[PDB]
From a paper:
The proteasome plays an essential role in protein degradation and is critical to maintaining cellular protein homeostasis. The mammalian proteasome core particle, 20S, is a large, barrel-shaped protein complex composed of four stacked heptameric rings, including two inner β-rings flanked by two outer α-rings that are each formed by seven different α or β subunits. In each α-ring, the N termini of the α subunits form a gate preventing unregulated protein entry and degradation. There are three types of known endogenous proteasomal activators that bind the 20S to open the α-ring gates.
One-step affinity purification using an NbALFA nanobody resin yielded proteasome assemblies capped with PA28, including double-capped proteasomes. Cryo-EM analysis of this sample allowed us to determine structures of single-capped PA28–20S and double-capped PA28–20S–PA28 to ∼2.8 and ∼3.3 Å resolution, respectively. The cryo-EM map of PA28αβ–20S purified by ALFA-PA28α pull-down allowed robust modeling of the side-chain densities of PA28αβ, allowing us to distinguish the subunit stoichiometry of the complex. The high-quality density map of the PA28αβ–20S complex reported here revealed a composition of three α and four β subunits, different from the 4α/3β assembly observed previously. Six out of seven C termini of endogenous PA28 engaged in stable interactions with the binding pockets of the 20S α-ring. There is one low-occupancy binding site situated between the 20S α1 and α2 subunits where a phenylalanine, 20S α1 F29, may be sterically hindering the binding of the C-terminal tail of PA28β. Interestingly, the cryo-EM map of PA28αβ–20S purified by ALFA-PA28α pull-down shows additional density inside the 20S antechamber that is proximal to the bound PA28. We suspect that this additional density does not represent endogenous substrates but rather is from ALFA peptide used to elute purified complex. However, the ALFA peptide density is only observed in the 20S antechamber that is proximal to the bound PA28, suggesting that the density could be uncleaved ALFA peptide that has just entered into the 20S proteasome through the PA28 activator rather than cleaved peptides on their way out of the proteasome.
Author numbering:
A (entry chain G): 7 to 245
B (entry chain J): 1 to 197
C (entry chain A): 3 to 231
D (entry chain B): 3 to 251
E (entry chain F): 5 to 244
F (entry chain C): 2 to 236
G (entry chain E): 2 to 240
H (entry chain D): 1 to 241
The structure:
């Protein structure tokens, strides 16, 4: 063949197989992340797996804060994830400097995604093998959830997942939105945790998951403590 | 300080210039030639700040001859005038303005004789007769007095001699000898130097 | 052979085959339809979503470059956005220079020049997207197509994407120059109705129109009203 | 094995095969034609795009005006054609800015051909897969017709055709063209004849051709595209003449 | 399969194999370990003596990247020295601009991003070094970080790199470093290195140790030779 | 193996792409040059009119300057570029040193340009060889030849292009001090040499002369017809 | 096969070895041997020169960088000349700026960085030359070796080039006495060490030996063919 | 049993296994295509000689310039690619004149040879300048000149290595010509004897019979400057043989 092995060249069917391989690179990590939106809150959950006891559990995280009121969860290569996180923080601060107001979540996602496009069009560099999911509150639009992928697609979502169990998780979430009644903050967090736990079969403990939330009442992105996570987990088991 | 004069006619253009190149007060050269033949039927007369004159004249000459070699036909006098004007005008804004005052004289088979005038600021003007230098102030009135659009070439050399002997009578600097040449359909023709002993 | 991989290499028989492959990438893109009515021009495309989870309001396949110009695409989504930003920038540069809204023909020329600019260099790939650029200028409608090759053509009506040949045949059967846009939008949704393989709804399609007023994306309620027929 | 790649390698026997492959491309193109006459020069081309749902919004799909005093018709890749025509217009206007005279036809052709040679020689860029005819009037040599190829090599022709069936067009023009005897009307009739011969369509549609003529009237060049009624009359006259020639036998 | 030739490439199954091949580089290296305790961080390296001719205190794998931080490396020594120069430049720039000693987490992040730059581009290979960084500041505390050739960075209570990583990691795991103090940790580091050293395959080694902590007033420094000799004698005694 | 890049040497140290360009020169139309005592004559064959083509556009012989001219055999576009570059260098040299170019100076410049294109990959050699003729300040006739490789050599008389081997063998036989004695004899010698390899005599040769202090003159077709008639009659 | 992974420096091998760097390290073996050894008060460089033919002069194997530093080369003379120019300019810069002789350790660090840059990037090859650097500074006499791989060592003694293992083993068995030697004893030891590398038929001569000495009171001096005769005469014979 | 894979010879900047860098070696093989040149250093001076290898009679003999003057004190003889030879000769000339400008003195033959050698070294492309040929210079030079140390003859090769040599031969018949040099040469020989011996060796190796036309000969002596034997002087010596 040879139509793979370079991002620039098109297949005879015009598919650009290299970026599709970058999509597989996300699943190679073996972790899953889920994001679900609510009427007044947006949450991100992801597996936290510590391979060795010696590792400091505090340092390992896939949840990062792009700015005070935006948070992200990265899935894929850890290094590419950290690099994209840094680029996102730079883009947000530069937006604030130039335009005088906090970057919208959609525009941040668009900037990061079009950067991913310049990666998937120029020859020498490779697409970053990571996926981003951004959550924030916009005053006009309420909560928001968005996802960047290695291709440059940046579509917004009511709820999403990324990682190895993405298809199972989106099947689960699709059923839940179809039986739409609402999602308050507690139900939002419960839906996220139930989705992740059901698709993985994990039956989590508080250490195994890390959750981050935004709410219209408290717009700042915060990563909940193990105690708060256990509080939500116990509520799930009780009912 | 240097004198250029040009007289257009029905089928010719007459041009003359002083032959003095000078230091502060010493008149280093008595037989300096300020006329550069860009082509067979076009002359460029140049006066101005030293160095700039010869540099600009040579540059335009070599560009015109390159045009000749590349394309097989000579530039028109009007085209050469516009080209040298463009080169001078571009340099005016730049840090190396050529302080040069030029008179371009030519004959075109289609468009007949032409005399062109440009100053150091690179304005361009076609004219029936024109002059450059401090002597021009004295001698232009002679041309404006006795010039006719139908002047014959013998009458033209006579008129030029009147213009130059006025400089001899009144102009403070010493411009003892002048060079004269005519352009016509045949081409540039050297004429005997009008020399006032 | 080697002609297949290189973009700056003419194949034997003189084909730049990577560009043909980019056109094949365009053909895989979703259906898009453009019909130039007498009083307007309609751009329509399917916005079929993988799941209910997708939020339709987040992204649009039909975008305005200017007040009086808008365009739609079939092909690669990221490439579409690169060139839509560049098109908006080119139009604003025209407005700064000439203080007049850019003509549609001029804009399609400029974006096609950009697309051609990309094909020449080996380090880059062609844009795997084609566009239908519609506009209303000088009290006249316009519709144009610009391909990955960097070439542009002027169509009374045309279709891109999946089943574009069959859609074009359906159009030339159904097309009348005297059509008003009220009818032309119906013809466009029918042209797409040929090729969905699904039950079209207000969400599953995105459609926009241009006229003396200018380009606009008619709302989900509007397209529901038109779909009711 | 393979000495046909990168456009910078002389193959054994010393041939640049990339430019030859590019010259192969123009043969696929729609036929374009140019004829030189005593009173004028014309460009005629076959509008290969004959899709029903195409609009003739532009001045011409194939014919381009480069300057007041000349025009061109293009056969080859349309994108490279657009680039080359833009470069041509800029070159002409640069000459007008410098010398305040119209660009000579041969000089403009030579400049663009220098560009086309340059793209052959340096490694990264491909040769321009274009061949285009130039028609113009210049004071030095009057009416002139010029052809160019992807190689960057040009020549002056009394009449020539580029594109599909160019060999048939040239064979027909060789016998028909009368040196020193053509007028614009006769050249138009010859153009219709050779186009009918080359083009596969039995009847030239008069929407499947575009004809433009360059003439000097009142000391100013005029480049005009014959309108659909004019070319309709021309094909009607040619059909009548050919049928009468048929009727006699 | 041409997927493994370059780092720009992806495998069809989503793997960038050049980076993994570079990760295999460090395993060729002799082991090095760093342990973090309450007082500070202790580093240790098993520096194999290739020849008697080579001077002692040469081929140092323990570098000082700033006064308050030290670096221990495994993998290609050339790449490691270059990375140390990069880290020193980053620390100096941080001091010059922001006016204080660089936080270790930030320094690890910057050098990790510099490393991660190389995995992307085709022109340049990934680094062939994996290195540990450690510092003590009264504000931040004891911090130990490890950077792989990929540019992944994490904080480790105890860490090992090189050939004997796994065995060293289990030995470190059975230690309870959090309660302990540095002057004991040097002895246990010596014990672990002497354990993991293979006498048959590796002819001889000279234990190279360093620490940073409150006992230094937050300056990374090479161990005083008396303490080195005490720890080495203890390690030989425990080895049996 | 070793023929795909200009930079790479082969085993035995052959650079083969430059050899391929030298081969490309052989495809071109013939050209011949001869040094008369007071004339230098440069003759070039003409491929064909084609009956719908204007001869003026195609001219192999060209004047770099008043005192120097060249003819080429090889790629026509490359020849045009090299001719223009040498012309601008001629005028620039006159600008710089207030003196007319010497024939060896201009052939050195053209050779240096061709060499510059050979040395670096990403550029292909100019597929031309040239025959440069001029009269120096002393008035001695000068004939030089250049090739794609970038070496230049003076020749009493030479040919380039197709049939160069045959015509140069003929010229090695024919050339002598006697033939150079007359200007007409020099012109007749070059005409006979081109007649050695050409389909037809008058139609297919374009010839030019440079005299001691005159510009280039392309001989009229009637003059060439008269000279071939004189040559034909003597046989 | 594994012909792949050998083409360029920028390609890692499946077992973590950059083969082009190793192929460059083979280059030092090609050159004629060199030996360097030090005492408490002196550092010595001695070399075996080679000649293309009887008529040709022997090549220059010892080069002086500064009064306090000089080098001897094994491997490509081109890379040797380039690196020597770089080192000389660095020492001149140090003397101009700080008015102190450059530390020899710092100089070899600079050499290591400059040499390392080719190995990692595509383009310029690794410097396929091995140098022995010997100098006296305030800390004391020093000898270093630099490989075509940018790694460098500090040595009590070292030998590089063809058949240098024999010299290395001689040096190792005789190393203890070197530290307290006189300069005459030390140069004699080094001469015997390089004599080990020579073929049995060949013997040390005035022509093919060059000696380089630097010390506290002695600036770097290369004792040439005529000047090596005092040092050579002491040596007894082949064993 | 034949193993001919090579697969590493192509492309400079590639160390083949055993680290041999074969492009430079092939360039060193390239000079064997060139005409044989020969140099002998003596106390009375250094002489240089070369076979012109005239292809055809019509070619002007003077135009072939395989021995040239870098300056009065130094001359060069070259075998290999004439073009890159011209490049290196230009470098030598400009460096000599730069030395005169800066220090008001004449360069030594060793310094001039080092100057050109530095340029030859640049095929490695360590410098970022675009205008340096990627290929090694496919030429070998013989630098002969009288300096403060007296007559000196230096040899330069495509690698850029340079050495003094009492007598050397470059080109096609360098193998065998060097053996003849080794037997004939003794340090005491005068320049007349050296000229005669070098012309004997050139006559032996040359395919064509030796004649004043097909050889170029030169000498630089301490009192004299670089001198080329004219047609008449060449006739006298080739008659004397």
């Amino acid at each position: 063949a040879g139509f793979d092995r370079h991002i620039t060249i098109f297949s005879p069917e015009g598919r650009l197989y290299q970026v599709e391989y970058a999509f597989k690179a996300i699943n190679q990590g073996g972790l899953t992340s889920v994001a679900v939106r609510g009427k007044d809150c947006a949450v991100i959950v992801t597996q936290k797996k510590v391979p060795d006891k010696l590792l400091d559990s505090s340092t390992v995280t896939h949840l990062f804060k792009i700015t005070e009121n935006i948070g992200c969860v990265m899935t894929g290569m850890t290094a590419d994830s950290r690099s994209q996180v840094q680029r996102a923080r730079y883009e947000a601060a530069n937006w604030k400097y130039k335009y005088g107001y906090e970057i919208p979540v959609d525009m941040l996602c668009k900037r990061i995604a079009d950067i991913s496009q310049v990666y998937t069009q120029n020859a020498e560099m490779r697409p970053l093998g990571c996926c981003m999911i951004l959550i924030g509150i916009d005053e006009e639009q309420g909560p928001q959830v968005y996802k960047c992928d290695p291709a440059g697609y940046y579509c917004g979502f009511k709820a999403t997942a990324a990682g190895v169990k993405q298809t199972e998780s989106t099947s689960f979430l699709e059923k839940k939105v179809k039986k739409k009644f609402d999602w308050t903050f507690e139900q939002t967090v419960e839906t996220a945790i139930t989705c992740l736990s059901t698709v993985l079969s994990i039956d989590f403990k508080p250490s195994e998951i890390e959750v981050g939330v935004v709410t219209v009442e408290n717009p700042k992105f915060r990563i909940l403590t193990e105690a708060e996570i256990d509080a939500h987990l116990v509520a799930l088991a009780e009912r | 300080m240097e004198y250029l004069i040009g007289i257009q006619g029905p089928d010719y253009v007459l041009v003359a210039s002083d032959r003095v190149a000078a230091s502060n007060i010493v008149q280093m050269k008595d037989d300096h030639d300020k006329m550069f033949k860009m082509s067979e039927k076009i002359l460029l007369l140049c006066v101005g700040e030293a160095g700039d004159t010869v540099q600009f004249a040579e540059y335009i000459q070599k560009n015109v001859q390159l045009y000749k070699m590349r394309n097989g036909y000579e530039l028109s006098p009007t085209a050469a005038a516009n080209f040298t004007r463009r080169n001078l005008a571009d340099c005016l804004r730049s840090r190396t303005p050529y302080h040069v005052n030029l008179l371009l004289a030519g004959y075109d088979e289609h468009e007949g004789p032409a005399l062109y005038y440009m100053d150091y600021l690179a304005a361009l003007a076609k004219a029936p007769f024109a002059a450059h230098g401090y002597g021009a102030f004295l001698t232009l009135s002679i041309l404006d007095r006795y010039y006719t659009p139908t002047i014959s070439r013998e009458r033209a050399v006579e008129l030029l001699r009147k213009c130059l002997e006025e400089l001899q009578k009144r102009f403070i600097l010493n411009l003892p000898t002048f060079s004269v040449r005519i352009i016509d359909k045949n081409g540039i023709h050297d004429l005997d130097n009008i020399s006032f002993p | 052979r080697g002609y297949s991989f290189s973009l700056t290499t003419f194949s034997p028989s003189g084909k730049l085959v990577q560009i043909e492959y980019a056109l094949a990438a365009v053909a895989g893109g979703a259906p898009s339809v453009g019909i130039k009515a007498a009083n307007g021009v309609v751009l329509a495309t399917e916005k079929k979503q993988k799941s209910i989870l997708y939020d339709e309001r987040s992204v649009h396949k039909v975008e305005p470059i200017t007040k009086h110009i808008g365009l739609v695409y079939s092909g690669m989504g990221p490439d579409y956005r690169v060139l839509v930003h560049r098109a908006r920038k080119l139009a604003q540069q025209y407005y700064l220079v000439y203080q007049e809204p850019i003509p549609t023909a001029q804009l399609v020329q400029r974006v096609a020049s950009v697309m051609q600019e990309y094909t020449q260099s080996g380090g880059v790939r062609p844009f795997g997207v084609s566009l239908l650029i519609c506009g209303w200028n000088e009290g006249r409608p316009y519709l144009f197509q610009s391909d990955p090759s960097g070439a542009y053509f002027a169509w009374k009506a045309t279709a891109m994407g999946k089943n574009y040949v069959n859609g074009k045949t359906f159009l030339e059967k159904r097309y009348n120059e005297d059509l008003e846009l009220e009818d032309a939008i119906h013809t466009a949704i029918l042209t797409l109705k040929e090729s969905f393989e699904g039950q079209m709804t207000e969400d599953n399609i995105e459609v926009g129109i241009c006229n003396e007023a200018g380009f606009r994306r008619l709302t989900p309620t509007e397209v529901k009203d038109y779909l009711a027929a | 094995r393979r000495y046909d790649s990168r456009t910078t390698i002389f193959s054994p026997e010393g041939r640049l095969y990339q430019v030859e492959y590019a010259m192969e491309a123009i043969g696929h193109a729609g036929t374009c034609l140019g004829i030189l006459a005593n009173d004028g020069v014309l460009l005629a081309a076959e509008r290969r795009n004959i899709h029903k749902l195409l609009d003739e919004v532009f001045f011409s799909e194939k014919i381009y005006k480069l300057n007041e005093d000349m025009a061109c018709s293009v056969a080859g890749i349309t994108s490279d054609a657009n680039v080359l025509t833009n470069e041509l217009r800029l070159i002409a206007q640069r000459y007008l800015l410098q010398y305040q005279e119209p660009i000579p036809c041969e000089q403009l052709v030579t400049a663009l051909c220098d560009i086309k040679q340059a793209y052959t020689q340096f490694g990264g860029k491909r040769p321009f897969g274009v061949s285009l005819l130039y028609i113009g009037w210049d004071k030095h040599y009057g009416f002139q017709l010029y052809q160019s190829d992807p190689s960057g090599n040009y020549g002056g022709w009394k009449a020539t055709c580029i594109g599909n069936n160019s060999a048939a067009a040239v064979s027909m023009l060789k016998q028909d063209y009368k040196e020193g005897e053509m007028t614009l009307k006769s050249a138009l009739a010859l153009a219709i004849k050779v186009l009918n011969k080359t083009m596969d369509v039995s009847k030239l549609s008069a929407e499947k051709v575009e004809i433009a003529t360059l003439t000097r009237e009142n000391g100013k060049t005029v480049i005009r595209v014959l309108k659909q009624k004019e070319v309709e009359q021309l094909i009607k006259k040619h059909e009548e003449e050919e049928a009468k020639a048929e009727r006699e036998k | 399969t041409g997927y493994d030739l370059s780092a720009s490439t992806f495998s069809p199954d989503g793997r960038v194999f050049q980076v993994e091949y570079a990760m295999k580089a460090v395993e060729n290296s002799s082991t090095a370990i760093g342990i973090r305790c309450k007082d500070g961080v202790v580093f240790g390296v098993e520096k194999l003596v290739l020849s008697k001719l080579y001077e002692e205190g040469s081929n140092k794998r323990l570098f000082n990247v700033d006064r308050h931080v030290g670096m221990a490396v495994a993998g290609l020594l050339a790449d490691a020295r270059s990375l140390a120069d990069i880290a020193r430049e980053e620390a100096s720039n941080f001091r010059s601009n922001f006016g204080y000693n660089i936080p270790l987490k930030h320094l690890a992040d910057r050098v990790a991003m510099y490393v991660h730059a190389y995995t992307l581009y085709s022109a340049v290979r990934p680094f062939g070094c994996s290195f540990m960084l450690g510092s003590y500041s009264v504000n931040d505390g004891a911090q130990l970080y490890m950077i792989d050739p990929s540019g992944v960075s994490y904080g480790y209570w105890g860490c090992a790199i090189g050939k004997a990583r796994q065995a060293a990691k289990t030995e470190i795991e059975k230690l309870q470093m959090k309660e302990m103090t540095c002057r004991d940790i040097v002895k246990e580091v010596a014990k672990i290195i002497y354990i993991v050293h293979d006498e048959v395959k590796d002819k001889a080694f000279e234990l190279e140790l360093s620490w940073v902590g409150e006992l230094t007033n937050g300056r990374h420094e090479i161990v005083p030779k008396d303490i080195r000799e005490e720890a080495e004698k203890y390690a030989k005694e425990s080895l049996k | 193996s070793y023929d795909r890049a200009i930079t790479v040497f082969s085993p035995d140290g052959h650079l083969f792409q430059v050899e391929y360009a030298q081969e490309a020169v052989k495809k071109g139309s013939t050209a011949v040059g001869v040094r008369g005592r007071d004339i230098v004559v440069l003759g070039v064959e003409k491929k064909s009119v084609a009956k719908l083509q204007d001869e003026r556009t195609v001219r192999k012989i060209c004047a770099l300057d008043d005192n120097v001219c060249m003819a080429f055999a090889g790629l026509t576009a490359d020849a045009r570029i090299v001719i223009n570059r040498a012309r601008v260098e001629c005028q620039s040299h006159r600008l710089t040193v207030e003196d007319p170019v010497t024939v060896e100076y201009i052939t050195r410049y053209i050779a240096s340009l061709k060499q510059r294109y050979t040395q670096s990959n990403g550029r292909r050699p100019f597929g031309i060889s040239a025959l440069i003729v001029g009269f120096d300040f002393d008035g001695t006739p000068r004939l030089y030849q250049t090739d794609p490789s970038g070496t230049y050599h003076a020749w009493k008389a030479n040919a380039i292009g197709r049939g160069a081997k045959s015509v140069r063998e003929f010229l090695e036989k024919n050339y002598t001090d006697e033939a150079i004695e007359t200007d007409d004899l020099t012109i007749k010698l070059v005409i006979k040499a081109l007649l050695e390899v050409v389909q037809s005599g008058g139609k297919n040769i374009e010839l030019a002369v440079m005299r001691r202090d005159q510009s280039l003159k392309i001989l009229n077709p009637e003059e060439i017809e008269k000279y071939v008639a004189e040559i034909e009659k003597e046989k | 096969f594994r012909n792949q992974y050998d083409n360029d420096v920028t390609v890692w091998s499946p077992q973590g070895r950059i083969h082009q760097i190793e192929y460059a390290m083979e280059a030092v073996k090609q050159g004629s041997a060199t030996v360097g050894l030090k005492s408490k008060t002196h550092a010595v460089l001695v070399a075996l020169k080679r000649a293309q033919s009887e008529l040709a002069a022997h090549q220059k194997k010892i080069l002086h960088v500064d009064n306090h530093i000089g080098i001897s080369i094994a491997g490509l003379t081109a890379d040797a000349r380039l690196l020597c120019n770089f080192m000389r300019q660095e020492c001149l810069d140090s003397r101009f700026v700080f008015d102190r002789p450059l530390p020899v350790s710092r100089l070899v660090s600079l050499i290591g960085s400059k040499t390392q840059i080719p190995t990692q990037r595509y383009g310029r090859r690794p410097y396929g030359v091995g140098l022995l650097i010997a100098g006296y500074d305030d800390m004391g006499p020093h000898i270093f070796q630099t490989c075509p791989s940018a790694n460098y060592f500090d040595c009590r003694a070292m030998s590089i080039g063809a058949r240098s293992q024999s010299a290395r083993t001689y040096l190792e068995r005789h190393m203890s006495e070197f530290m307290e030697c006189n300069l005459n004893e030390l140069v004699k030891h080094g001469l015997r060490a390089l004599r080990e590398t020579l073929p049995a038929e060949q013997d040390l001569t005035t022509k093919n030996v060059s000696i380089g000495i630097v010390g506290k009171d002695l600036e770097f001096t290369i004792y040439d063919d005529d000047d090596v005769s005092p040092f050579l005469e002491g040596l007894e014979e082949r064993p | 049993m034949f193993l001919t894979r090579s697969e590493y010879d192509r492309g400079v900047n590639t160390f083949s296994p055993e680290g041999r860098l074969f492009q430079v070696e092939y360039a060193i093989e390239a000079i064997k295509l060139g005409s044989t040149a020969i140099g002998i250093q003596t106390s009375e001076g250094v002489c240089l000689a070369v076979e012109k290898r005239i292809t055809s009679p019509l070619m002007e003999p003077s135009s072939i310039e395989k021995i040239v003057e870098i300056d009065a004190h130094i001359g060069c003889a070259m075998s290999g690619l004439i073009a890159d030879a011209k490049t290196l000769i230009d470098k030598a000339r400009v460096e000599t004149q730069n030395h005169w400008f800066t220090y008001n003195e004449t360069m030594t033959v060793e310094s001039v040879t080092q100057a050109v050698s530095n340029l030859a070294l640049q095929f490695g492309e360590e410098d970022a300048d675009p205008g340096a040929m990627s290929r090694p210079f496919g030429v070998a030079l013989l630098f002969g000149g009288v300096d403060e140390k007296g007559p000196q003859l230096f040899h330069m090769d495509p690698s850029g290595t340079f050495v003094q040599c009492d007598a050397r031969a470059i080109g096609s018949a360098s193998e065998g010509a060097q053996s003849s040099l080794q037997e004939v040469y003794h340090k005491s020989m005068t320049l007349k004897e050296a000229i005669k011996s070098s012309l004997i060796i050139l006559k032996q190796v040359m395919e064509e019979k030796l004649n004043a036309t097909n050889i170029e000969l030169a000498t630089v002596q301490p009192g004299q400057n670089f001198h080329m034997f004219t047609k008449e002087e060449l006739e006298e010596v080739i008659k004397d043989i």
